[PDB]
Amino acid sequence: MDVFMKGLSKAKEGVVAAAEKTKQGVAEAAGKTKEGVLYVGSKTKEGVVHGVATVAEKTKEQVTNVGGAVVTGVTAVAQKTVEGAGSIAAATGFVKKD
Amino acid sequence: MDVFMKGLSKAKEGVVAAAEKTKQGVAEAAGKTKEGVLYVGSKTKEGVVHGVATVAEKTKEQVTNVGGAVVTGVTAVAQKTVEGAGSIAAATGFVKKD
Amino acid sequence: MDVFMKGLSKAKEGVVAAAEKTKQGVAEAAGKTKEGVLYVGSKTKEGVVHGVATVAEKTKEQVTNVGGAVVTGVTAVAQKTVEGAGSIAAATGFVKKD
Amino acid sequence: MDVFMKGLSKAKEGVVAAAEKTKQGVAEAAGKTKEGVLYVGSKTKEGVVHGVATVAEKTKEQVTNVGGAVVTGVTAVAQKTVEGAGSIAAATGFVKKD
Amino acid sequence: MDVFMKGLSKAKEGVVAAAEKTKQGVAEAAGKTKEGVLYVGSKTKEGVVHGVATVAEKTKEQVTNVGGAVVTGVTAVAQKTVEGAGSIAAATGFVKKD
Amino acid sequence: MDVFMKGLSKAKEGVVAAAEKTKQGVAEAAGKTKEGVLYVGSKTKEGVVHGVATVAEKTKEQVTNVGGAVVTGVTAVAQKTVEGAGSIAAATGFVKKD
């Protein structure tokens, strides 16, 4: 079970170059992410919200937030004359300069 | 079971160049993502919202949010004279410069 | 079971160049995504909303949101003189410059 | 990949009875057999005979045997008033004797 | 990968009865056998005979045997008033005798 | 990877009865056997005979045996009034005798 590979796997005489993701000026809020996850015979239970109650009576204002991730604010990014955020990959092999 | 591969897998004499995603000026809010997920014989239960109640009586205002991810705000990005966020991949092999 | 591959798989003498996605000035809100997901004999249950109640009586205002992901706000992006977010892949092999 | 099964496989409410082979008075010599063999991505090399030489000169007798299995003799079986070699399988289920 | 099973596999409410092989008065000589063999990504090399030479000169007799298994003799079986060699399997379930 | 099973595997409410092989009056000579063998990513080399030489000159007799297993003799079995060699398996479940 060879699952996640970046290169030579049961191979011969390879020249591999692999880059990866970049981010420049990103503002995320309450996000989830799974990159390269492998379950084998497992049993999970993720991110549930259960049994929520909320009562109001003769009140003038009520603001409630329930969740896995609550974001109530400013998530700002400001850039100016920003230069260079990149993943470079170079590979060279089996050269015969004679 | 060879599942996720980037390169040579049971091969010979390869020249492979692989790049990857980029992001420049992205604003995400309450997003989910799964890249390269593999389940084998597993049993999961993800992201459920169950049994929510909300009562109001003679109240003047009631604002409620329930969820897996609640975002109530500003998620802003501002760029100016920003330059360069990219994934480059170069590969070279089996060259005979004589 | 060779499922996800980018390159040579049971091959010989290949020159492969693969790029990937780009994003420049993207604003997503409460989105889902699955890229390269493989289930084998698994059993899942994702993203359900069950048993929601909401009562109002003699109230002047009631604003409720229930869901897997609730976004109530501004998700803005502003760019100006932004240059370059791209994935490049170059491959070269089996050259005989004599 | 459910390959060899004798019974219920992803089923419900079954009554299965399976018997198997019998042998009574059998004489085998230099035989091969494969029952329930499964190869996955494997590479084998079985039972080869390679590069055999044999020279005679002014000799009065030469008897040679080369092989994977050489049997030069008596393989005999003798039975008399022999009784009973059989595989029986009985199954009974979901009976409602009222 | 559920390969060899005798009974219930991912099932419910089963009544299974399985018997197996029998032998009574058997004489085998230099035999091979494989029952329930599973290779995964393996590499084997079984039972080879390579590079055999045999020279005779002015000799009166030469008897040679080469192989994976050489049997030069008597393999005899004699039975008389022999009774009973069998595999029995009985199964009973979900009976409601009222 | 559930490979060899005799009974309930990921099941419920089963009644399983499994018997097995029998032997009565068997004479084997230089036999091989593999029952329930599983290789995973392994590399083997079994039972080879390589580089055998044999020279005779002015000799009156020469008897040679080379192999993985050499049997030169008597392998006899004699039975008389022999009774009973069998594998029995009985199973009973979920009976409601009222």
Curated annotation (Swiss-Prot), chains A, B, C, D, E, F:
Molecular function as annotated in GO: actin binding; alpha-tubulin binding; beta-tubulin binding; calcium ion binding; copper ion binding; cuprous ion binding; cysteine-type endopeptidase inhibitor activity; dynein complex binding
Compartment(s): Cytoplasm; Membrane; Nucleus; Synapse
PTM annotation (N-acetylmethionine): residues: 1
GO terms under cellular component: actin cytoskeleton; axon; axon terminus; cell cortex; cytoplasm; cytosol; extracellular region; extracellular space
Phosphoserine: residues carrying this PTM: 87
Effect after changing residue 50 to A: Impairs copper-binding
Keyword Secreted: yes
Outcome, altering residue 46 to K: In PARK1 and DLB; significant increase in binding to negatively charged phospholipid liposomes; increases oligomerization
Effect of residue 50 to Q: In PARK1; no effect on protein structure; no effect on phosphorylation of the protein; no effect on membrane- and lipid-binding; increases oligomerization; increases fibril formation; increases secretion of the protein; impairs copper-binding
Tissue: Highly expressed in presynaptic terminals in the central nervous system. Expressed principally in brain.
PTM characteristics: Phosphorylated, predominantly on serine residues. Phosphorylation by CK1 appears to occur on residues distinct from the residue phosphorylated by other kinases.
Domains: entry comment: The 'non A-beta component of Alzheimer disease amyloid plaque' domain (NAC domain) is involved in fibrils formation. The middle hydrophobic region forms the core of the filaments. The C-terminus may regulate aggregation and determine the diameter of the filaments.
Quaternary context: Soluble monomer. Homotetramer. A dynamic intracellular population of tetramers and monomers coexists normally and the tetramer plays an essential role in maintaining homeostasis. Interacts with UCHL1. Interacts with phospholipase D and histones. Interacts (via N-terminus) with synphilin-1/SNCAIP; this interaction promotes formation of SNCA inclusions in the cytoplasm. Interacts with CALM1. Interacts with STXBP1; this interaction controls SNCA self-replicating aggregation. Interacts with SNARE components VAMP2 and SNAP25; these interactions allows SNARE complex assembly and integrity.
Family per record: Belongs to the synuclein family.
Recorded disease: Genetic alterations of SNCA resulting in aberrant polymerization into fibrils, are associated with several neurodegenerative diseases (synucleinopathies). SNCA fibrillar aggregates represent the major non A-beta component of Alzheimer disease amyloid plaque, and a major component of Lewy body inclusions. They are also found within Lewy body (LB)-like intraneuronal inclusions, glial inclusions and axonal spheroids in neurodegeneration with brain iron accumulation type 1. Parkinson disease 1, autosomal dominant: A complex neurodegenerative disorder characterized by bradykinesia, resting tremor, muscular rigidity and postural instability. Additional features are characteristic postural abnormalities, dysautonomia, dystonic cramps, and dementia. The pathology of Parkinson disease involves the loss of dopaminergic neurons in the substantia nigra and the presence of Lewy bodies (intraneuronal accumulations of aggregated proteins), in surviving neurons in various areas of the brain.
Function summary: Neuronal protein that plays several roles in synaptic activity such as regulation of synaptic vesicle trafficking and subsequent neurotransmitter release. Participates as a monomer in synaptic vesicle exocytosis by enhancing vesicle priming, fusion and dilation of exocytotic fusion pores. Mechanistically, acts by increasing local Ca(2+) release from microdomains which is essential for the enhancement of ATP-induced exocytosis.
Protein name listed in UniProt: Alpha-synuclein
This protein's encoding gene: SNCA
